[PDB]
Amino acid sequence: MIITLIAAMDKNRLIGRNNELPWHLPADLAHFKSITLGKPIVMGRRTFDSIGKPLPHRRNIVITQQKNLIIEGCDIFYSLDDALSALTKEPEVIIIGGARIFKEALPKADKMILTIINHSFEGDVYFPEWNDKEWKITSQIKHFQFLELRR
Numbered sequence: 001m002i003i004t005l006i007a008a009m010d011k012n013r014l015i016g017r018n019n020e021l022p023w024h025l026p027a028d029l030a031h032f033k034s035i036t037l038g039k040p041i042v043m044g045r046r047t048f049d050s051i052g053k054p055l056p057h058r059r060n061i062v063i064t065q066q067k068n069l070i071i072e073g074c075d076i077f078y079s080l081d082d083a084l085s086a087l088t089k090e091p092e093v094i095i096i097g098g099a100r101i102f103k104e105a106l107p108k109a110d111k112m113i114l115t116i117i118n119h120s121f122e123g124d125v126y127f128p129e130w131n132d133k134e135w136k137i138t139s140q141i142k143h144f145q146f147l148e149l150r151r
């Protein structure tokens, strides 16, 4: 199984603001769609609320501790380990946040597909810091920039 993290962030690793994206970049959202299409996507419960509905054409997997919580069109597991365990037969799994999910996944992640933006936005939640000396930049397309890293 190839564990992959995908996230759009700024120079200070900001990702969210009051349970929302602090920006709107259609180019990044189209990039997110093509990358995630036809694959499992694991997300935190607040990230689902951020989206508002299941992402179409994709197996939406939602992590939560609420044991009676039901969600229409998503599979619910009670830990990241029960998610990865249930997707053992899968070839690739995509983690899309939020911060607590990203943090727990980072040490298990094989690949990273990250969008870095040359701007300083205001916010509250952030992407947890990786170690630049552990990763290798596979692809870097400068338009923001689509940055692919591989451990």
Ligand SMILES: NC(=O)C1=CN([C@@H]2O[C@H](COP(=O)(O)OP(=O)(O)OC[C@H]3O[C@@H](n4cnc5c(N)ncnc54)[C@H](OP(=O)(O)O)[C@@H]3O)[C@@H](O)[C@H]2O)C=CC1
Residues within 6 Å of the ligand: 006, 007, 008, 009, 014, 015, 016, 017, 018, 019, 020, 021, 043, 044, 045, 046, 047, 048, 050, 063, 064, 065, 066, 078, 079, 080, 096, 097, 098, 099, 100, 101, 104, 125
């Ligand atoms: N720019 C980007 O690429 C991204 C941005 N974001 C932004 O981040 C914000 C949402 O993310 P964030 O606020 O960090 O919250 P998260 O999406 O990380 O979700 C937190 C909640 O998910 C559940 N959860 C998380 N980890 C676990 C675990 N290990 N086991 C069981 N349950 C777990 C818990 O829900 P419960 O209380 O139900 O147990 C917890 O309260 C939004 O503003 C969104 O826009 C999010 C993803 C990507």
Ligand SMILES: Nc1nc(=O)c2nc(CNc3ccc(C(=O)N[C@@H](CCC(=O)O)C(=O)O)cc3)cnc2[nH]1
Residues within 6 Å of the ligand: 006, 007, 008, 021, 028, 029, 030, 032, 033, 036, 047, 050, 051, 055, 056, 096, 097, 114, 115
């Ligand atoms: N690179 C990247 N950018 C993001 O904005 C992003 N956002 C999340 C969490 N929040 C979101 C917010 C919006 C959509 C979303 O509307 N995506 C649609 C795009 C539809 C369209 O192109 O019009 C999708 O189909 O995936 C998904 C997740 C997780 N990873 C990300 N990764």
